[PDB]
């Protein structure tokens, strides 16, 4: 039942150019801190986010996704004319209509045969996009697919910071405004291909999903997320043949340091097998997983035969887990 | 001579289908009364809604109805039509242009409302007016492989906000001719919802079969129609011209892979942008207008829900017979054109 002929031909990520440190955020919030007596560095000391990146002004999700896509095409050594499917998986989107994917595709110059659309599913959508493309590849509908994802948070910082520093601002809800201050900009793209076209490329096996949509209505997210992941890992054991000790890397979405630690603790996972970029980049939504995988690749951390788990707990709640064999 | 499948879907069926008509009628007559001072200032003497676009009314929800609410209503009805419980659903895809939130997915909200099981996979697909077909295709690939038994594809569209804000903008004493023309097509949209239960054919032997189909694109035209929650700007002239061109390419592909010849199809379920756009389309391809049901005159353009709403209305009217070959066709902002077949 697992995918037999689906590979990863190319992968890339883009780090956004402007740094906004939590120290800087705090300095701006200090007056509002002194009111309401906050006296605690939630971002730096609790969430463990010390910085995030922002794009230049007027960079759209499509722009960021396009930048990542160009780099992933180079990584795959293929021209855009080969791409038969382009899926955009980002939370950030240019418009409701048309798809952000169509705009990225127009920027790249895809052929008139190229099928495009957006998939949206909180921080899990890139994994969903990979599965969707894998099924088309497997059936022989296309030879190469792009899965792209650009996230923008400039506007959310501008508005939230502006809001939080107003004289009328009250606390109880304000504490929830801090959550948006864990988001970061970044982009990633992956070229997937039929395996007979790219021997020796990493193989995508597919995965499993379990949901708890009864919770679609942060402290709560943590516990219920781990409960859900436990269900999903049980499923993974059966369809993927997973055993924690047998996996070489866990590439996981990152909400915060506490959430990641609780996860590692719960599954008895070796923390050395869990790369994290949240400290410097914050939460890049559904782009997080492929950005981390790309960083692992560029750092030479991945060796032929490594078993790599891709996973996340997303708003929904949903939990998806998938395997790549490098 | 042994031949392949052309990669069309095998053993994928439509177990159930439903639509919801939104409750409140807004007539083009009332809209024109509101716009009359602006028409007069701009020298507009023709009824550009009723006579040119060909829309006489559209339906709206209440202000507090979200896309997920409308989608949920359609889904409950589709389950009844398929005579199955929500526990049988292994995939739920939401395909609407309208969206509750950036996150989580509208699909997750509908799923929570319906009470899907913990095995249910859910996500949104967005692709302007073609997304319902994309969702059917995505579900079909899983059903054909036997990964799931049943899937829901759901779509609720809410145009209340775009009507409210567009009418305000278009009645400004200062609105320009250019912006009035830019936003006019928003007054051809309508509210409504649809849902479809798809299934492995072995579970529903007598149900209609879904074959899938073909897509062609012209993404250099991605700027032609841009829409958000409260505004849609549309180059109607170029949509028509470039749309027809794209559809001609797609029809060539349809002939190749679906073996289509227009006279051999029994029904064409065509997404509608406007009466003249549809007339040009039908004329361009020599389609028999009697094989084209339209609801645009009284419901307007319901985006990606349009095709399944019209299919549901056809089923309910008793217009569809066993063996009927039904073409599902649309040109969506992108630009994209998709053509697919259902055998009743």
UniProtKB/Swiss-Prot annotation, chain B:
Outcome of substituting residue 129 to A/S: Strong decrease in activity. Displays measurable CoA release only after incubation for 24 hours
E.C. number: 2.3.3.20
Recorded GO CC terms: cytoplasm
CDD domains: KAS_III
Enzyme class name: transferase
One BP term from GO: fatty acid biosynthetic process
Activity regulation text: Inhibited by cerulenin.
One Pfam family recorded for the sequence: ACP_syn_III_C
Superkingdom of origin organism: Bacteria
Chief location bin: cytoplasm
Catalytically driven reaction(s): a 1,2-saturated acyl-CoA + an acyl-CoA + H2O = an (R)-2-alkyl-3-oxoalkanoate + 2 CoA + H(+)
One Gene Ontology MF term: metal ion binding
Listed result of changing residue 103 to D: Hydrolyzes 50% of the substrate after incubation for 24 hours. Decrease in the formation of the beta-keto acid product
InterPro entries to which the protein is assigned, alphabetical: ACP_syn_III_C, ACP_syn_III_N, Thiolase-like
Keyword entries, A-Z: Acyltransferase, Cytoplasm, Manganese, Metal-binding, Transferase
Annotated active site: 103, 129
Quaternary structure annotation from Swiss-Prot or TrEMBL: Homodimer. Weakly associates with the OleBCD complex.
Family note: Belongs to the thiolase-like superfamily. OleA family.
Role, per record: Involved in olefin biosynthesis. Catalyzes a non-decarboxylative head-to-head Claisen condensation of two acyl-CoA molecules, generating an (R)-2-alkyl-3-oxoalkanoate. Is active with fatty acyl-CoA substrates that ranged from C(8) to C(16) in length, and is the most active with palmitoyl-CoA and myristoyl-CoA.
Name recorded for this polypeptide: Acyl-CoA:acyl-CoA alkyltransferase
Source organism (scientific name): Xanthomonas campestris pv. campestris (strain ATCC 33913 / DSM 3586 / NCPPB 528 / LMG 568 / P 25)
Lineage per the UniProt record: Bacteria, Pseudomonadati, Pseudomonadota, Gammaproteobacteria, Lysobacterales
